[PDB]
Amino acid sequence: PLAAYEVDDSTGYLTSDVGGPIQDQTSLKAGIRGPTLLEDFMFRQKIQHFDHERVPERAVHARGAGAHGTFTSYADWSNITAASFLNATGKQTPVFVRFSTVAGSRGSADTARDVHGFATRFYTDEGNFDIVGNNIPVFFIQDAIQFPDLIHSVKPRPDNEIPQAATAHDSAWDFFSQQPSTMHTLFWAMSGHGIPRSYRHMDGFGVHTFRFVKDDGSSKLIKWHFKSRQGKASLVWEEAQVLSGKNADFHRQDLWDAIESGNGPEWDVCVQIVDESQAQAFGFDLLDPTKIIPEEYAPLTKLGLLKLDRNPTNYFAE
Amino acid sequence: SPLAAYEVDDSTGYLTSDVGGPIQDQTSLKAGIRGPTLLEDFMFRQKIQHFDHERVPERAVHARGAGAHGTFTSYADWSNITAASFLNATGKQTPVFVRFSTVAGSRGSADTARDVHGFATRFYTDEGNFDIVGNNIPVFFIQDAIQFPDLIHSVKPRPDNEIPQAATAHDSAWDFFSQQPSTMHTLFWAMSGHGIPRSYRHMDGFGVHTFRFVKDDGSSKLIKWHFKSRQGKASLVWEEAQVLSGKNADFHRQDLWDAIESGNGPEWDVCVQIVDESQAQAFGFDLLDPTKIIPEEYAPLTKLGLLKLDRNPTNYFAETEQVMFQPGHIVRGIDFTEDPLLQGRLFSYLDTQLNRNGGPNFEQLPINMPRVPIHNNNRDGAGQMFIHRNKYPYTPNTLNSGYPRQANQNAGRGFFTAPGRTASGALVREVSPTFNDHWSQPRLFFNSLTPVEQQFLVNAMRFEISLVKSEEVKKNVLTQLNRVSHDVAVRVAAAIGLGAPDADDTYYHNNKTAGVSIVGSGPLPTIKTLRVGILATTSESSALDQAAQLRTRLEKDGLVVTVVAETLREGVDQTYSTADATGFDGVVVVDGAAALFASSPLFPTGRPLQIFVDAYRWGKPVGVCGSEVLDAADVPEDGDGVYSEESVDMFVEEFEKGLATFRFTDRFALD
Amino acid sequence: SPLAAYEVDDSTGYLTSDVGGPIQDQTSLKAGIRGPTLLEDFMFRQKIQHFDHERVPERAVHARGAGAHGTFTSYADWSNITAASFLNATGKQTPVFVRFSTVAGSRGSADTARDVHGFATRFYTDEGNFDIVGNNIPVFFIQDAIQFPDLIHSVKPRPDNEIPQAATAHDSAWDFFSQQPSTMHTLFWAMSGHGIPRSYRHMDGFGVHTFRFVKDDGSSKLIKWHFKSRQGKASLVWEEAQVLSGKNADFHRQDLWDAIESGNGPEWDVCVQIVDESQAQAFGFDLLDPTKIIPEEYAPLTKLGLLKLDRNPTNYFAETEQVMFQPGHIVRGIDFTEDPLLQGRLFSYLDTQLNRNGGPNFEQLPINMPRVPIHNNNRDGAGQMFIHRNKYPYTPNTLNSGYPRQANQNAGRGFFTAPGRTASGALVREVSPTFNDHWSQPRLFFNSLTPVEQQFLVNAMRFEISLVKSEEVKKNVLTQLNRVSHDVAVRVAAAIGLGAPDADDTYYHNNKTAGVSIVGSGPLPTIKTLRVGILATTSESSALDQAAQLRTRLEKDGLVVTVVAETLREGVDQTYSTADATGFDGVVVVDGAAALFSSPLFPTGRPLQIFVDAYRWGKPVGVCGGKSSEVLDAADVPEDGDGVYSEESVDMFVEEFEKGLATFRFTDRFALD
């Protein structure tokens, strides 16, 4: 879907960024054993580019991997939402999804114990729509202003930057025990959901209650749940620890390989739908992101199919 | 110190904004108790904006690393060889900051990846900051700085999928090595135990390039920097390094932190080899070529002073992450050479700090500031922290009386280029033919390793090359290895089911050189800081008693003792669940714990025995204090570095000799 | 200086790099004396890299401006109306920094463009930095912050060619004003002399929005800030402003610099109008609407304290260019209101400093730092200058014993939102109907100007609208002007060859309000710093003697005297070649110089032109020495005219002339419709 921006270098002579044919293997020098010249523009443009290749990693979810795919609607959902990408049976919309851990930096291991991200972009015919979700349906904290507190406590201690990609240190458990809202997500992260077998074997959750709004202005409250068609599976902890050393790229490799072999992963994109009047009807507040609606109270409605079937061409760019 | 002036204490006080207004930061301002958040909540937005902008780009290479403060002390007045002020008096002390690192991995990757390692030292001298930006290996992969992006692209993850992290074990890296034969020398070093050092404290530092020492009289000599570890040389074994990468990605940074906190700050003798300008081509290779060492048999080391690291940072980001080294940070008494790798580095390190810092005033960060006054006409730029009084910042001026004054060889202790340096010839993009021997020195290095050390190197190559998918790349790799040693090519080929090319003896020889072997460098000069795991049990009071007796003795000898049992209690440091052989340099089982080595919901099946067995396999001293345990572990009682004594004092004595030996290499099979 | 700790002295010493290595910086390192420059020349590259990176983005608006340090002194303990610490005791002093500005022009545009002006004040209080980010006009063009990019795109240069600089005199601006009638009130102010103030010292400052004062007991009142100039109100005339833009683009920044250096630092009474919460809609308009003033007849000013600027910056870039104001810099005792213009500003000023500074640690620049300790869990970010000792920067913690502690109404002197504030109703993107009268107050303002002042305003509109190319836009402008005043529309239409639409009297009225007229504000309360040009000649020793005597007499009273002659010598400050009437507030010819009134030393007719321009622009003018007819006749200046002086006696001349300087402008010299 990004073909128009692709650059092919399978043929041709080396050029500068302004199209002048050049070389890039030997510096220009004052004599064969001489000092390098400032007028060597070939050197400086190449090294300046290299010197500036890096960008800041994401503040959270720095470690992750993505793929392209397609979403297909199962129905015309106009009777619950005006959303154009949901307005006809079989309607297809391109997607890009990125999966991730939360705490680790770039280069940390895929198989750290953590909450995982599941972020989906729908490139819809009425604008990009993102559902920026996790593999656990509830969050640690009840107010966004507390996010830097949570994240500072779980990330490495700031004097020595130890430990990488782990909640197994004093500050994280200090925060958890002082901020009891954290208990629900904590129990999830300490279950097998903290060490999924693959990105393909976990679900995605919007976490928050959102609204579906009809063209007539009426609204309903929803929760997003992307239900894996591959099943649910976890690693065991001792296995995850060994994998972190033997293959830090385990989840990104698993996803890459599944797509290359024609086994692109699939999810049913689902919602729980409830009335505005039920905001406090279930024994908790639907505005509270530490709570799930039990499925016994509100069943899942299947809206469409999410399939990832194409790997990126350039990881950095995409 | 700029660092002291900028320390901020938050041990008391009410929360404030960055402009000193007392505030709260725990609940958003809302229109009603269950209402939407207000745009006028400045407390929320200042806090979240800061958080949203916390990250800066990681270093383009050496992103993963850790640092410490210390001191350098000169052994003498070195005026006879250099004008450098920090070297001008016996006992002269200069503060330092050192950062150690890997090369290829991103900032959250494992310390115990196989890689070249950085060793960058800043001397905050009384005549300006002087940086020696070195590595733990004395030779570099390439001969011209313009090739650096090619090398680094090839070793970093493949750019479609960003796989694999922090590893040369992939097609692209070996494609580059096999097409660019200059890489052979550093490749052999990286495939030896030097690619997986036991700690930052158990590796040396090298400037790599030939530099110049310049006297006040203008004369110069050629030098190589070598920082020689006082802790000894030591490596991990590969399988141990792999497990460590998973069990403790922070192993080297933790080791350094802990050594400093315990008053065991690491030391190096800062040394040089010093040779005349006339010897640039006298040793059978070109001193401008960064792929070559000067064998110590040709030029001995002169010890200049002592480097000790003895203080940890207060804030990792502010100090370690933000330190911005440059070989362009040079001082009077030192000069560059025409090494084309060094020449291009000078450009890169000034430029790249713009990417990291986002603005041009990065030398104003406390960790980058000098410890002497700054007088220049640099002005403005984002993040300008100075208020300059001189309103006429141009030269020549009369309106500021000609200040600042020009400094040079004869004024103001100026830096000056060594005045004997010249250039002659065409302006060329050509490689000197004197750089063409890419294979003799790799062979010199290989010859200088012990038999088991040669096996480990062959095995590292077998491991990595077997993961290369391309048959063509693998064949090209054997072609290059064969030019160094036919035997290496044969032994590597055997693992990958290919035939080695016929011997090509052009560069073969039997010469050896001192000081490059880890295995051959003898026992460690100190065992302070080394880690002993005592495997005990809570089920026998006798076991805990035995462990406490061992601890008392071992700890007075400077060892870090961890008592392991099923559950924590007084005297027990670690559970079996969290323990691993990679956490110890030696393992002792107290004989009261024998039953554990024969199931529990408290640790994985067979964990106690696996710790002992792994430690044995990886060559560590292992013992039982107080037959059955050795039988279960299939460990021979009469084995070198296997201890069995009922007497604690006898055991401690023998085990401590084992720790100094460090690795019992007779436990590894040889071709 | 309040920023002395950050000052770097370079009055002695040898050149160093930024890391303290002594170096040189005058010749590049080359391979041979006629050879190519070497890459290893670190001296060259560090110097040129710094130079290459000196610039930062100019401010998105108010890019052209100048600042100074000073002190605020409270007149009382104001705890009866506000908890604010800087206002809590008689005589309490707080350091300030003020920046003044235009709005539309880029850096390097002229100070004397016709524009709204900024007046931004930082109080470095003992409870945090408090900024009042105000303008010299009390009302704003638009009623909702989301419209700001629309307003600013329309007044800034057309984006295909970037023309015209620093001017509303183009189609897009007048298109916007005519389509967005909220603009009328500020437009009338900008077209008055308030758009071309005589100096930053001769204008007032306004917070524009209604804010709240909040007591420690939680009760609140509604306030408007008004900084009233102790120097008086004064404007340029338009033609003079145009010439000044060319002859001295730095006129206002120079005037401020010089007033401070001479010990005439400018002063303002910092005042508020104070009204009850119940009066939000009591005055015939909504106090949440930033296009309305509270007439002083309804709510008098209370003087809170004295603002004096008395110290110039040491480094303009470091201090004036880098100062980053925010209405989010608020302190306990002050709160916001639901004015939708103010509400959106709060977002903009925090975000825009990321663009200017290139990183998130902009509050660490010396000019932005507070004068009290900072305790928080903000961290890292590019350019982090602090080394934080607390290794547990999260709340709630036990590992740092629960510090920093939360501050709020009841503990730690925390900021708190006024607790009486509420919201109710639908979540809406709708404009309150209470905001709908866009025309009554523009008419109130116009009615309050004197006849010649009304003429100047009409003439400013005639000038600008005549430059609008679109006839449809011009018609639309007349439609809006006509809703304020039929007479304004008729008089403007006359210059542009269109007919005014028929009177629409819906919003017409005859009401006036005090304190908005410049022309009617009376003589200046001080003439210190005002500029007198004495036109002399080197041809006659007597003329120079006259000029020296006059200089002595005028300087005694704090006037800034410039003696002009053909060439420089002792006692002569400026040549005729560099002299212009825009450089003076009054012009005196010494009668020994009468013959001057051609040479290779100045343009033909220059001496007379200075005198004639000064007269045309309304300034006091005169001839000292007793013989005046030759000069006055050559200038076509009547000898009996108001603000025209002639005396032999230097003492008697100066006494009369000084009354003229206080009158400042002789408005009888301007024709009326």
Ligand code: HDD
């Ligand atoms: C107030 C701050 C804040 C809060 C409360 C949250 N996040 Fe967030 N999140 C960020 C601030 C943030 C961020 C700093 O803005 C990031 C970093 C990179 C980015 O684009 O946004 C981010 C990244 C980020 C990503 C990575 C997207 C990617 O792959 O590029 C995911 C999946 C999430 N977050 C998911 C969540 C979920 C499911 C949350 C709770 C329901 C949540 N975040 C709360």
Ligand code: HDD
């Ligand atoms: C032409 C480019 C180039 C070349 C040929 C080299 N480097 Fe380099 N090096 C860089 C470009 C660079 C860089 C991109 O400029 C880095 C990234 C971060 C920084 O400050 O500089 C860097 C970082 C860097 C660091 C990390 C410093 C720290 O801890 O912050 C070390 C130790 C080295 N390098 C050492 C070497 C050695 C021993 C080399 C060969 C003798 C070498 N580099 C060649």
Ligand code: HDD
């Ligand atoms: C929503 C956007 C927005 C709106 C509605 C306003 N402004 Fe503003 N203002 C900015 C967005 C902004 C800004 C883009 O954020 C600037 C550019 C530089 C800066 O620091 O903030 C700015 C600068 C700025 C300055 C220059 C401060 C200095 O000297 O550095 C002054 C004096 C004002 N403004 C005054 C006002 C007044 C009196 C307004 C109406 C009552 C107003 N602004 C509305």
Ligand SMILES: [Ca+2]
């Ligand atoms: Ca911790």
Ligand SMILES: [Ca+2]
């Ligand atoms: Ca499980």
Ligand SMILES: [Ca+2]
């Ligand atoms: Ca590859």
Ligand SMILES: [Ca+2]
């Ligand atoms: Ca080894």
Ligand SMILES: [Ca+2]
């Ligand atoms: Ca236009």
Ligand SMILES: [Ca+2]
């Ligand atoms: Ca509050």
